[PDB]
Amino acid sequence: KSPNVLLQNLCCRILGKSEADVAQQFQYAVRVIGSNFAPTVERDEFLVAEKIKKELTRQRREADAALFSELHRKLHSQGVLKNKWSILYLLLSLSEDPRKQPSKVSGY
Amino acid sequence: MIHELLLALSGYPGSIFTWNKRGGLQVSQDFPFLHPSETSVLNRLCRLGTDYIRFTEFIEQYTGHVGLHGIYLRAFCTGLDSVLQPYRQALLDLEQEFLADPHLSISHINYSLDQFQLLFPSVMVVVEQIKSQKIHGCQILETVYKHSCGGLPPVRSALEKILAVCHGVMYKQLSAWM
Amino acid sequence: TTVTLAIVVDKLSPRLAQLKVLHKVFSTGVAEVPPDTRNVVRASHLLNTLYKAILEYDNVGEASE
Amino acid sequence: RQYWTTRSSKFPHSLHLHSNLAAVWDQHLYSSDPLYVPDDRVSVTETQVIRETLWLLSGVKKLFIFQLIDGKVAVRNNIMVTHLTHSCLRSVLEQIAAYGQVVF
Amino acid sequence: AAAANLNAVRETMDVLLEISRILNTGLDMETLSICVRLCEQGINPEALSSVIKELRKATEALKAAEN
Amino acid sequence: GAVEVTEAALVRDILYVFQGIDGKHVKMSNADNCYTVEGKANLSKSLRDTAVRLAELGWLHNKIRKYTDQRSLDRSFGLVGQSFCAALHQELREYYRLLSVLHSQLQLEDLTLRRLLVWTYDPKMRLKTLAALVDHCQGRKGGELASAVHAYTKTGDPYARSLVQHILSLVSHPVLSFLYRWIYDGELEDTYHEFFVASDP
């Protein structure tokens, strides 16, 4: 229920360990989270979506990019989430490239 | 709106989209609440619906009796119906999708059906050629091959299926003789 | 499950086609035979209509199976 | 509710334009002719229409939507569904009705 | 009301699942809702990403040591 | 009071213009061959300018559409011409699928003009390249068509390069099939006379 409890549950699920068996990792996580609780920049999902589309193009998946645009439309149409920017940023930070060799030209 | 459009593409003319014996299906100019561009797009689809209606009338007229007559003409009608079956299925799938998401636009239907805009005109051209030239017996095979030589891959695949069925009949008669 | 009228019509399409052929055959085999015809004559007309329809449809092939 | 019961209960199935095209069409007629009176049509559900059609194809002789006149199955002229146009609904019901008459 | 909320949450979860699989993010089922439910609290998503990356690194290290 | 068209209404009209059919307040001036925003409605200069910049895309759209429709019906244009028309139809349908996404999003709103410009930037490049290819490729057939495509392959822009290489593979599949049949069957299906081997009967 409490955000700390949810973080503990998440770490337990990720490590496949008991709550006590991740205390050091949990302590590191608590320090990391307590470092910053509020975002330092404005929220606006259009930039997130544009970045997502650019990443998909860089991954040679333009059809998947169109699918992502469609799915973003569907989500915002059936909007039940008020903090999408955050979840989009999370998913972007967690995105991987399984369909191509790992290499990217630096963005500015 | 959307349900009546799907009905009209399914062959059920409505109040906004009326059937003309000469023109086929067309959008009523009097239908309010549509943007004029929407009416134009609808009429572009209605050209396909018109061709579908005319094809269905032709199929029923020339297949239902078991003047041009013959088993090859019946096989042609059966082939046309079997090639239009995927269009019917895609129309059902579109219907389900539009029932699934009320925020989908008519443009979604037009995109989902755009692939048929190329197949249908070519087959209608072939059908009208068969009708006008009164092609009979194996001359139907000749006509279908000649039109099958077209460059449109969707047309090529459809005509190949039709030609294969007609050749299956010709070959059956040949088998009987030989 | 969401069953729509279009889905029902499509599901019945093969049965509707069979019914349409059956109705044409029935009209030709029975309704065209005058009731004032001797039973042998009515039967012979029905049987000949059936035979001719069978021979007509046999040449259509697998699409009419 | 028994659709064969002479009490028309108009229930709006939704406020969505795509769901009320029939109501939208009647409103278009009312908006195009200020003397246009909507015909008194019995509101039937699409599911109910489907079930009545299945009963017709199963051989039920006394259907509310499809009236048998002179050995021809005919649609009652006073039937409306919220999500179908009367002309389209009529055309589809008549296409089914021709086979219903043959079967009958 | 509750039926509508359940429908909405189901469809949102399906959309998020599809978005995850199309992006090939690599996340498993349990990040079904709770992880995002945490992010919905207004938590710094950059830090959340950093911590989840660290946890993934630790988990891979532990699975490599075990294997 | 004058009618000034709202941002949403201008978006709806411009999306109709993008679909290749004019709006209710912005209409194709057929004395310039581009969509002009009427002056009966009062919009700011920047809004009208953006509308024009976007209707450039509608102009290209309608040109490509007319060319594809017209050339698609002539069996005399040959298999290569029909394949070119098919490829163009396919790209057009991709563009239309994006336009339909943008329509659907607008109706779900029922988006700003600048965001729409950004969304339309990439379509502008693609359709510009395709229209230019079409114009340079008009009046040629068969191996002239194949050469025309191979000439467009020389573009240095990589987005254009990939588009044109796909189109060239599609357009060569028929030519390659003809040549394969000439090499394997020792026979010709040349009834249009587009293959570089002439048989003289």
XYZ file of C-alpha atoms in Angstrom:
723
model
C 0.000 0.000 0.000
C 2.626 2.503 1.081
C 5.107 3.580 -1.603
C 7.952 2.065 0.389
C 6.014 -1.191 0.730
C 5.395 -1.194 -3.014
C 9.093 -0.615 -3.649
C 9.912 -3.514 -1.332
C 7.446 -5.743 -3.171
C 8.901 -4.706 -6.523
C 12.444 -5.466 -5.403
C 11.289 -8.802 -4.008
C 9.656 -9.679 -7.320
C 12.704 -8.570 -9.323
C 15.237 -10.472 -7.209
C 13.005 -13.473 -6.537
C 14.056 -13.186 -2.893
C 12.431 -12.495 0.448
C 12.032 -8.965 1.771
C 14.907 -9.423 4.221
C 17.226 -10.948 1.617
C 17.349 -7.680 -0.368
C 17.920 -5.300 2.546
C 21.258 -4.007 1.270
C 19.852 -3.660 -2.226
C 16.689 -2.237 -0.697
C 18.771 0.221 1.320
C 20.581 1.350 -1.825
C 17.227 1.709 -3.566
C 15.816 3.727 -0.674
C 18.796 6.070 -0.789
C 18.405 6.427 -4.553
C 14.701 7.184 -4.309
C 15.088 9.596 -1.417
C 17.674 11.412 -3.502
C 14.852 12.831 -5.641
C 11.097 12.478 -5.149
C 9.891 15.144 -7.604
C 10.740 15.573 -11.293
C 13.185 18.353 -12.116
C 11.709 19.126 -15.561
C 8.295 19.845 -17.019
C 6.024 17.019 -18.150
C 4.754 16.916 -21.732
C 4.213 13.568 -23.421
C 4.481 14.866 -26.985
C 8.264 15.054 -26.663
C 8.320 11.562 -25.168
C 6.333 10.192 -28.088
C 8.557 11.985 -30.579
C 11.627 10.510 -28.920
C 10.004 7.080 -28.994
C 9.273 7.407 -32.705
C 12.822 8.564 -33.398
C 14.206 5.597 -31.473
C 11.976 3.209 -33.397
C 13.134 4.689 -36.684
C 16.730 4.348 -35.547
C 15.823 0.721 -34.874
C 14.419 0.351 -38.412
C 10.877 -0.354 -37.199
C 8.809 2.387 -38.842
C 5.779 0.104 -39.040
C 6.169 -0.481 -35.313
C 6.415 3.298 -34.954
C 3.052 3.708 -36.650
C 1.674 1.016 -34.366
C 3.041 2.895 -31.360
C 1.415 6.097 -32.561
C -1.880 4.244 -32.900
C -1.525 2.770 -29.417
C -0.692 6.176 -27.950
C -3.839 7.523 -29.568
C -5.860 4.663 -28.105
C -4.427 5.208 -24.624
C -4.976 8.943 -24.568
C -8.476 8.376 -25.931
C -9.338 5.980 -23.108
C -7.312 8.085 -20.676
C -7.492 6.864 -17.088
C -3.894 7.787 -16.198
C -2.990 11.341 -15.176
C 0.819 10.992 -15.010
C 1.551 9.406 -18.381
C 4.781 11.385 -18.904
C 6.316 9.373 -16.088
C 5.292 5.948 -17.391
C 6.378 6.861 -20.903
C 9.768 7.969 -19.600
C 10.066 4.739 -17.621
C 9.263 2.591 -20.639
C 11.672 4.600 -22.777
C 14.437 4.153 -20.229
C 13.662 0.437 -20.136
C 13.497 -0.017 -23.907
C 15.944 -2.455 -25.506
C 16.937 -3.360 -29.084
C 16.705 -7.114 -29.695
C 16.291 -6.836 -33.462
C 19.583 -5.093 -34.258
C 23.220 -4.988 -33.227
C 23.850 -2.494 -30.388
C 25.143 0.836 -31.749
C 23.845 4.427 -31.707
C 25.117 7.791 -32.939
C 25.245 10.305 -30.091
C 22.335 12.725 -29.822
C 22.719 16.336 -28.696
C -23.380 6.449 -39.591
C -20.672 3.822 -39.469
C -23.076 0.886 -39.212
C -25.038 2.142 -42.217
C -21.824 2.584 -44.194
C -20.816 -0.973 -43.399
C -24.296 -2.099 -44.426
C -24.053 -0.239 -47.724
C -20.667 -1.769 -48.439
C -22.285 -5.068 -47.450
C -24.903 -4.506 -50.145
C -27.766 -2.937 -48.184
C -28.464 0.539 -49.595
C -29.679 3.029 -47.009
C -31.192 6.521 -46.900
C -27.888 8.394 -47.137
C -26.235 5.899 -49.504
C -28.714 5.052 -52.260
C -28.559 2.464 -55.046
C -28.999 3.716 -58.605
C -29.501 1.079 -61.278
C -27.190 3.204 -63.452
C -24.647 4.574 -60.963
C -24.541 1.970 -58.225
C -24.201 3.023 -54.610
C -23.727 6.738 -54.015
C -23.810 9.154 -51.088
C -26.943 11.247 -50.775
C -26.032 14.903 -51.216
C -28.650 15.751 -48.552
C -27.061 13.866 -45.656
C -26.364 16.536 -42.999
C -23.688 16.534 -40.295
C -20.972 15.128 -42.601
C -18.114 17.381 -43.583
C -18.069 17.798 -47.382
C -14.695 16.094 -47.436
C -16.301 13.205 -45.588
C -19.015 13.042 -48.234
C -16.317 12.998 -50.918
C -14.429 10.165 -49.230
C -17.685 8.299 -48.784
C -18.437 8.654 -52.492
C -14.955 7.368 -53.280
C -15.792 4.285 -51.236
C -19.252 4.157 -52.795
C -17.605 3.683 -56.172
C -16.303 0.392 -54.796
C -19.690 -0.401 -53.300
C -21.318 0.285 -56.658
C -18.951 -2.102 -58.365
C -19.633 -4.683 -55.660
C -23.390 -4.390 -56.180
C -23.032 -4.723 -59.942
C -20.764 -7.728 -59.504
C -23.252 -9.383 -57.178
C -26.143 -8.844 -59.578
C -24.046 -10.314 -62.386
C -23.000 -13.313 -60.281
C -26.577 -14.103 -59.324
C -27.850 -13.687 -62.888
C -25.219 -15.943 -64.472
C -24.670 -18.597 -61.772
C -28.103 -19.358 -60.349
C -29.432 -21.425 -63.290
C -28.256 -25.013 -62.987
C -27.838 -15.881 -74.541
C -24.504 -16.809 -73.031
C -24.749 -19.984 -70.984
C -22.354 -22.651 -69.854
C -20.502 -24.300 -67.037
C -17.567 -22.018 -67.697
C -19.796 -18.993 -67.092
C -21.000 -20.575 -63.860
C -17.397 -21.270 -62.851
C -16.553 -17.628 -63.553
C -19.358 -16.489 -61.269
C -18.187 -18.900 -58.562
C -14.627 -17.634 -58.902
C -15.722 -14.020 -58.615
C -17.688 -14.823 -55.475
C -14.707 -16.695 -54.019
C -12.445 -13.733 -54.750
C -14.898 -11.307 -53.178
C -15.130 -13.449 -50.046
C -11.971 -11.888 -48.543
C -13.559 -8.487 -49.022
C -16.593 -9.623 -47.056
C -14.350 -10.978 -44.298
C -12.370 -7.750 -44.109
C -15.660 -5.876 -43.879
C -16.698 -8.032 -40.939
C -13.353 -7.451 -39.224
C -13.654 -3.702 -39.747
C -17.151 -3.887 -38.287
C -15.810 -5.599 -35.175
C -13.011 -3.052 -34.798
C -15.386 -0.101 -35.071
C -17.658 -1.741 -32.514
C -14.578 -2.155 -30.308
C -13.370 1.479 -30.343
C -15.989 4.238 -30.659
C -13.271 6.850 -31.195
C -12.188 5.265 -34.500
C -12.830 7.466 -37.544
C -14.300 6.728 -40.958
C -10.756 7.244 -42.196
C -9.883 4.041 -40.358
C -12.404 2.148 -42.473
C -11.098 3.821 -45.616
C -7.561 2.762 -44.786
C -8.625 -0.759 -43.944
C -10.444 -1.015 -47.279
C -7.943 0.817 -49.473
C -6.437 -2.449 -50.726
C -9.767 -3.334 -52.313
C -9.846 -0.078 -54.274
C -7.229 -1.537 -56.614
C -8.419 -5.147 -56.905
C -12.081 -4.420 -57.594
C -11.712 -2.084 -60.611
C -9.538 -4.584 -62.481
C -11.918 -7.480 -61.930
C -14.867 -5.298 -62.915
C -13.024 -4.428 -66.121
C -12.523 -8.131 -66.817
C -16.160 -8.945 -66.051
C -17.411 -6.175 -68.328
C -15.101 -7.413 -71.072
C -16.450 -10.961 -70.724
C -20.000 -9.613 -70.887
C -19.478 -7.297 -73.836
C -17.588 -9.864 -75.907
C -19.966 -12.708 -74.981
C -16.965 -14.955 -74.443
C -18.071 -18.581 -74.526
C -16.499 -21.869 -73.551
C -12.728 -21.922 -73.790
C -12.796 -18.360 -75.054
C -13.501 -17.484 -71.439
C -10.181 -19.127 -70.590
C -8.444 -17.150 -73.325
C -9.961 -13.888 -72.114
C -9.058 -14.550 -68.498
C -5.455 -15.376 -69.396
C -5.103 -12.233 -71.501
C -6.451 -10.071 -68.704
C -4.366 -12.006 -66.163
C -1.257 -10.790 -67.913
C -1.828 -7.433 -66.174
C 0.866 -5.876 -63.994
C -1.151 -5.479 -60.775
C -0.020 -8.099 -58.240
C -3.398 -8.164 -56.490
C -5.064 -8.522 -59.863
C -2.545 -11.158 -60.876
C -3.236 -13.283 -57.800
C -7.011 -12.985 -58.172
C -6.979 -13.814 -61.859
C -4.628 -16.721 -61.238
C -7.116 -18.187 -58.785
C -9.984 -17.724 -61.242
C -7.967 -19.142 -64.128
C -6.908 -22.131 -62.047
C -10.536 -22.938 -61.251
C -11.604 -22.558 -64.873
C -8.680 -24.673 -66.033
C -9.767 -27.253 -63.475
C -13.098 -27.395 -65.265
C -11.611 -27.439 -68.755
C -9.234 -30.165 -67.598
C -12.170 -32.082 -66.160
C -13.919 -32.043 -69.534
C -10.645 -33.022 -71.183
C -10.314 -35.876 -68.710
C -13.820 -37.011 -69.588
C -13.021 -36.979 -73.304
C -9.585 -38.579 -73.082
C -19.707 -13.254 -27.326
C -20.763 -10.310 -29.460
C -22.832 -11.846 -32.274
C -23.843 -9.297 -34.903
C -26.349 -9.602 -37.721
C -23.542 -9.443 -40.258
C -21.762 -12.317 -38.535
C -24.988 -14.315 -38.535
C -25.672 -13.620 -42.211
C -22.131 -14.625 -43.109
C -22.366 -17.782 -41.013
C -25.599 -18.719 -42.773
C -24.323 -17.793 -46.261
C -23.496 -21.402 -47.257
C -26.840 -22.550 -45.917
C -28.591 -19.650 -47.621
C -26.951 -20.656 -50.905
C -28.025 -24.264 -50.466
C -31.550 -23.067 -49.679
C -31.637 -20.854 -52.771
C -30.634 -23.747 -54.996
C -33.137 -25.997 -53.247
C -35.931 -23.468 -53.761
C -35.183 -23.182 -57.459
C -35.089 -26.971 -57.810
C -38.290 -27.397 -55.806
C -40.156 -24.828 -57.858
C -39.119 -26.517 -61.085
C -39.703 -30.064 -59.841
C -43.061 -29.617 -58.095
C -44.698 -26.255 -58.675
C -44.415 -26.625 -62.445
C -46.146 -30.041 -62.396
C -49.924 -29.530 -62.671
C -51.875 -31.085 -59.797
C -54.312 -32.512 -62.356
C -51.482 -34.725 -63.580
C -51.614 -38.435 -62.932
C -49.285 -39.456 -60.136
C -47.033 -41.265 -62.612
C -46.833 -38.115 -64.749
C -46.105 -35.801 -61.821
C -43.442 -38.215 -60.583
C -41.833 -38.541 -64.004
C -41.676 -34.765 -64.371
C -40.133 -34.324 -60.927
C -37.629 -37.131 -61.536
C -36.614 -35.700 -64.904
C -36.201 -32.235 -63.410
C -34.005 -33.698 -60.687
C -31.925 -35.661 -63.204
C -31.377 -32.606 -65.397
C -30.484 -30.397 -62.437
C -28.017 -33.007 -61.178
C -26.345 -33.208 -64.570
C -26.182 -29.411 -64.809
C -24.609 -28.980 -61.376
C -22.131 -31.884 -61.630
C -20.048 -29.942 -64.187
C -19.541 -26.986 -61.821
C -16.841 -28.730 -59.785
C -15.555 -28.407 -56.246
C -16.917 -24.867 -55.750
C -20.462 -26.344 -55.658
C -19.591 -29.476 -53.657
C -39.718 -7.320 -22.793
C -41.900 -9.303 -25.184
C -41.476 -7.380 -28.426
C -44.836 -8.878 -29.398
C -46.361 -6.746 -26.645
C -48.045 -3.660 -28.014
C -46.315 -1.329 -25.528
C -43.473 0.478 -27.291
C -40.831 1.258 -24.674
C -38.230 3.554 -26.243
C -34.998 2.821 -24.384
C -31.967 4.780 -25.665
C -29.126 2.272 -25.832
C -26.546 5.090 -25.729
C -25.869 8.759 -26.445
C -23.279 7.915 -29.128
C -23.936 9.267 -32.605
C -22.796 6.007 -34.117
C -25.203 4.147 -31.823
C -28.243 6.341 -32.643
C -27.932 6.801 -36.405
C -31.588 5.851 -36.710
C -32.463 8.514 -34.181
C -30.072 10.808 -36.014
C -31.833 10.042 -39.296
C -35.245 10.754 -37.799
C -33.815 13.984 -36.409
C -32.467 14.822 -39.863
C -35.937 14.336 -41.313
C -37.426 16.474 -38.535
C -34.758 19.107 -39.202
C -35.344 19.104 -42.948
C -39.147 19.276 -42.729
C -40.558 21.218 -39.751
C -43.833 19.416 -40.486
C -42.099 16.027 -40.622
C -43.818 13.667 -38.186
C -41.763 10.591 -37.225
C -43.636 7.453 -38.132
C -44.803 5.510 -35.098
C -42.199 2.756 -35.195
C -41.812 -0.074 -32.702
C -38.325 -0.024 -31.222
C -36.728 -3.465 -31.436
C -33.301 -4.532 -30.269
C -30.768 -5.792 -32.769
C -30.423 -8.971 -30.735
C -34.198 -9.319 -30.777
C -34.181 -8.828 -34.550
C -31.548 -11.534 -34.908
C -33.524 -13.914 -32.712
C -36.730 -13.303 -34.663
C -34.823 -13.950 -37.885
C -33.442 -17.197 -36.495
C -36.967 -18.196 -35.492
C -38.137 -17.343 -39.001
C -35.466 -19.559 -40.518
C -36.399 -22.211 -37.952
C -39.972 -22.036 -39.238
C -41.883 -19.943 -36.694
C -45.057 -18.801 -38.401
C -46.058 -15.869 -36.151
C -43.231 -13.331 -36.044
C -43.766 -9.743 -34.953
C -41.282 -8.087 -37.309
C -41.926 -10.322 -40.321
C -45.613 -10.451 -41.246
C -46.679 -13.270 -43.577
C -49.016 -11.737 -46.164
C -50.419 -13.887 -48.978
C -47.786 -16.532 -48.355
C -44.992 -13.960 -48.565
C -42.970 -13.115 -45.474
C -43.022 -9.322 -45.242
C -41.458 -6.972 -42.735
C -43.867 -4.901 -40.699
C -43.519 -1.370 -42.010
C -43.506 0.120 -38.492
C -40.254 -1.387 -37.117
C -37.198 0.644 -36.091
C -33.802 -0.233 -34.616
C -31.587 2.428 -33.040
C -28.373 1.402 -34.802
C -29.732 0.615 -38.288
C -31.324 2.872 -40.870
C -34.899 1.996 -41.754
C -34.021 1.625 -45.427
C -30.954 -0.460 -44.667
C -32.763 -2.459 -42.005
C -35.652 -2.967 -44.401
C -33.346 -4.040 -47.222
C -31.486 -6.543 -45.059
C -34.646 -7.926 -43.520
C -36.158 -8.253 -46.998
C -33.088 -10.057 -48.296
C -33.463 -12.537 -45.466
C -37.246 -12.558 -45.919
C -37.057 -13.751 -49.510
C -35.360 -16.905 -48.285
C -37.716 -17.058 -45.326
C -40.660 -17.048 -47.729
C -39.065 -19.793 -49.815
C -38.439 -21.911 -46.724
C -41.963 -21.224 -45.453
C -18.969 2.942 -11.605
C -16.739 0.115 -10.424
C -17.496 -1.837 -13.589
C -16.368 1.120 -15.683
C -13.203 1.508 -13.629
C -12.404 -2.194 -14.001
C -12.967 -2.012 -17.761
C -10.794 1.084 -18.047
C -7.983 -0.448 -16.021
C -8.130 -3.675 -18.011
C -7.904 -1.826 -21.318
C -5.147 0.452 -20.046
C -3.186 -2.576 -18.862
C -3.627 -4.246 -22.241
C -2.467 -1.100 -24.024
C 0.570 -0.838 -21.759
C 1.358 -4.518 -22.309
C 1.236 -4.010 -26.064
C 3.368 -0.873 -25.805
C 5.922 -2.789 -23.754
C 6.067 -5.693 -26.173
C 6.309 -3.418 -29.211
C 9.102 -1.432 -27.589
C 10.788 -4.706 -26.569
C 11.447 -3.233 -23.143
C 11.969 -6.709 -21.715
C 9.814 -6.347 -18.600
C 7.885 -9.274 -17.148
C 4.314 -9.600 -15.948
C 4.688 -8.417 -12.358
C 5.500 -4.921 -13.572
C 1.817 -5.222 -14.557
C 0.552 -2.323 -12.465
C 2.341 -1.839 -9.180
C 5.532 -0.505 -10.669
C 3.580 1.931 -12.794
C 1.223 2.504 -9.870
C 4.292 3.786 -8.056
C 5.270 5.978 -10.957
C 1.726 7.380 -10.938
C 2.425 8.793 -7.467
C 4.564 11.511 -9.050
C 7.878 9.776 -8.361
C 10.957 10.975 -10.200
C 10.817 8.698 -13.248
C 14.491 9.221 -14.033
C 15.454 7.965 -10.588
C 12.905 5.170 -10.907
C 14.548 4.149 -14.171
C 17.991 4.312 -12.590
C 16.943 2.140 -9.662
C 15.180 -0.408 -11.851
C 18.266 -0.547 -14.065
C 20.390 -1.149 -10.980
C 18.039 -3.900 -9.832
C 18.192 -5.507 -13.278
C 21.994 -5.406 -13.185
C 21.991 -6.968 -9.723
C 19.539 -9.667 -10.797
C 21.600 -10.534 -13.866
C 24.724 -10.638 -11.709
C 23.022 -12.957 -9.224
C 21.716 -15.226 -11.984
C 25.200 -15.353 -13.501
C 26.763 -16.221 -10.155
C 24.123 -18.886 -9.546
C 24.603 -20.297 -13.049
C -19.357 39.824 -36.671
C -16.789 38.292 -39.007
C -16.186 34.538 -38.846
C -12.762 33.647 -37.493
C -12.161 29.915 -37.712
C -11.087 28.259 -34.498
C -7.839 26.349 -34.247
C -9.765 23.085 -33.991
C -11.922 23.976 -36.985
C -8.876 24.953 -39.015
C -7.298 21.651 -38.023
C -10.372 19.770 -39.215
C -10.445 21.656 -42.503
C -6.728 21.163 -43.108
C -7.059 17.463 -42.327
C -9.753 17.276 -44.969
C -7.398 19.157 -47.285
C -4.707 16.606 -46.510
C -7.077 13.807 -47.390
C -7.177 15.303 -50.887
C -10.660 16.845 -50.605
C -10.991 20.544 -49.893
C -12.256 21.888 -46.574
C -15.101 24.220 -45.651
C -13.022 27.403 -45.295
C -9.759 26.470 -47.073
C -10.338 25.445 -50.680
C -8.189 24.419 -53.618
C -7.558 27.434 -55.795
C -7.437 25.765 -59.202
C -5.994 28.956 -60.691
C -2.753 28.273 -58.833
C -3.164 24.507 -58.279
C -2.890 24.866 -54.518
C -5.225 25.263 -51.569
C -5.822 28.852 -50.489
C -7.602 29.875 -47.305
C -10.615 32.020 -48.074
C -10.551 35.640 -46.980
C -14.209 35.659 -45.997
C -12.993 33.983 -42.819
C -10.496 36.046 -40.826
C -7.446 34.129 -39.613
C -4.074 35.480 -38.614
C -1.323 35.702 -41.182
C 0.706 32.953 -39.554
C -2.250 30.592 -39.405
C -3.002 31.177 -43.078
C 0.665 30.726 -43.959
C 0.865 27.461 -42.041
C -2.289 26.312 -43.768
C -0.741 27.028 -47.160
C 2.508 25.328 -46.200
C 0.506 22.262 -45.254
C -1.777 22.291 -48.298
C 1.352 22.023 -50.400
C 1.131 18.416 -49.262
C -2.452 18.200 -50.468
C -1.344 19.506 -53.850
C 1.276 16.791 -54.136
C -1.232 14.241 -52.841
C -3.772 15.135 -55.486
C -1.191 15.126 -58.260
C 0.045 11.666 -57.285
C -3.549 10.489 -56.912
C -4.614 11.667 -60.351
C -1.524 10.188 -61.972
C -2.024 6.829 -60.295
C -5.723 6.654 -61.107
C -5.242 7.581 -64.745
C -2.233 5.414 -65.534
C -3.619 2.433 -63.616
C -6.306 1.682 -66.216
C -4.143 1.485 -69.374
C -3.153 -2.106 -70.098
C -1.089 -0.582 -72.906
C 1.251 0.965 -70.333
C 2.626 -2.504 -69.641
C 3.371 -4.569 -66.587
C 6.134 -2.223 -65.463
C 3.742 0.714 -65.552
C 1.141 -1.225 -63.621
C 3.735 -2.191 -61.014
C 4.793 1.430 -60.659
C 1.164 2.347 -60.084
C 0.839 -0.414 -57.489
C 3.894 0.741 -55.557
C 2.577 4.283 -55.580
C -0.818 3.122 -54.348
C 0.954 1.324 -51.499
C 2.910 4.382 -50.391
C -0.242 6.458 -50.727
C -2.050 4.041 -48.445
C 0.684 4.350 -45.827
C 0.261 8.119 -45.980
C -3.497 7.744 -45.718
C -3.138 5.445 -42.708
C -1.179 8.129 -40.924
C -3.705 10.745 -41.967
C -6.451 8.527 -40.569
C -4.547 8.231 -37.309
C -4.426 11.998 -37.118
C -8.124 12.265 -37.936
C -9.009 9.706 -35.270
C -6.956 11.631 -32.725
C -8.737 14.841 -33.644
C -12.111 13.180 -33.232
C -11.084 11.705 -29.893
C -10.290 15.265 -28.941
C -13.812 16.031 -30.080
C -3.324 18.660 -31.015
C -2.096 22.031 -32.254
C -1.263 23.311 -35.708
C 2.445 23.324 -34.907
C 2.398 19.761 -33.641
C 0.576 18.849 -36.834
C 3.294 20.542 -38.874
C 5.866 18.476 -37.032
C 3.885 15.300 -37.616
C 3.606 16.207 -41.309
C 7.285 17.028 -41.859
C 8.290 13.448 -42.715
C 5.268 12.912 -44.947
C 6.313 16.052 -46.775
C 9.714 14.591 -47.598
C 8.361 11.209 -48.651
C 5.612 12.536 -50.899
C 7.869 15.232 -52.353
C 10.359 12.589 -53.405
C 7.618 10.404 -54.841
C 6.020 13.239 -56.818
C 9.375 14.290 -58.215
C 10.112 10.716 -59.253
C 6.707 10.556 -60.936
C 7.245 13.780 -62.853
C 10.685 12.772 -64.060
C 9.408 9.267 -64.855
C 6.470 10.427 -66.954
C 6.471 9.537 -70.632
C 8.666 6.427 -70.376
C 7.996 2.702 -70.449
C 9.659 -0.666 -70.103
C 13.403 -0.520 -70.004
C 13.156 3.246 -70.095
C 11.164 2.975 -66.881
C 13.781 0.676 -65.366
C 16.523 3.119 -66.319
C 14.484 6.024 -64.963
C 14.246 4.331 -61.579
C 17.902 3.363 -61.545
C 18.690 7.017 -62.225
C 16.657 8.123 -59.236
C 18.571 5.639 -57.103
C 21.524 8.069 -57.314
C 19.943 10.421 -54.747
C 22.160 11.139 -51.750
C 19.392 11.530 -49.165
C 19.142 8.158 -47.394
C 15.397 8.270 -46.682
C 14.779 8.930 -50.354
C 17.413 6.359 -51.256
C 15.668 3.592 -49.340
C 12.245 4.529 -50.697
C 13.542 4.520 -54.255
C 15.435 1.268 -53.794
C 12.276 -0.442 -52.598
C 10.370 0.997 -55.544
C 13.120 -0.130 -57.912
C 13.093 -3.678 -56.574
C 9.328 -3.794 -56.994
C 9.518 -2.375 -60.507
C 12.296 -4.745 -61.503
C 10.513 -7.848 -60.264
C 8.390 -7.904 -63.454
C 11.331 -7.055 -65.720
C 13.419 -9.658 -63.944
C 10.627 -12.181 -64.371
C 10.475 -11.479 -68.102
C 14.231 -11.879 -68.432
C 14.172 -15.060 -66.369
C 11.490 -16.467 -68.644
C 13.539 -15.486 -71.694
C 16.584 -17.195 -70.184
C 14.775 -20.329 -68.980
C 11.851 -20.961 -71.306
C 13.468 -19.629 -74.422
C 10.106 -17.954 -74.900
C 8.641 -14.469 -74.780
C 5.443 -13.145 -73.250
C 6.162 -9.785 -74.879
C 2.843 -8.510 -76.201
C 3.532 -4.914 -75.158
C 7.056 -4.932 -76.619
C 8.816 -3.824 -73.450
C 11.459 -6.577 -73.272
C 14.860 -5.893 -74.781
C 14.735 -9.107 -76.859
C 12.663 -8.641 -80.012
C 11.225 -11.693 -81.701
C 10.422 -11.151 -85.366
C 7.729 -13.568 -86.602
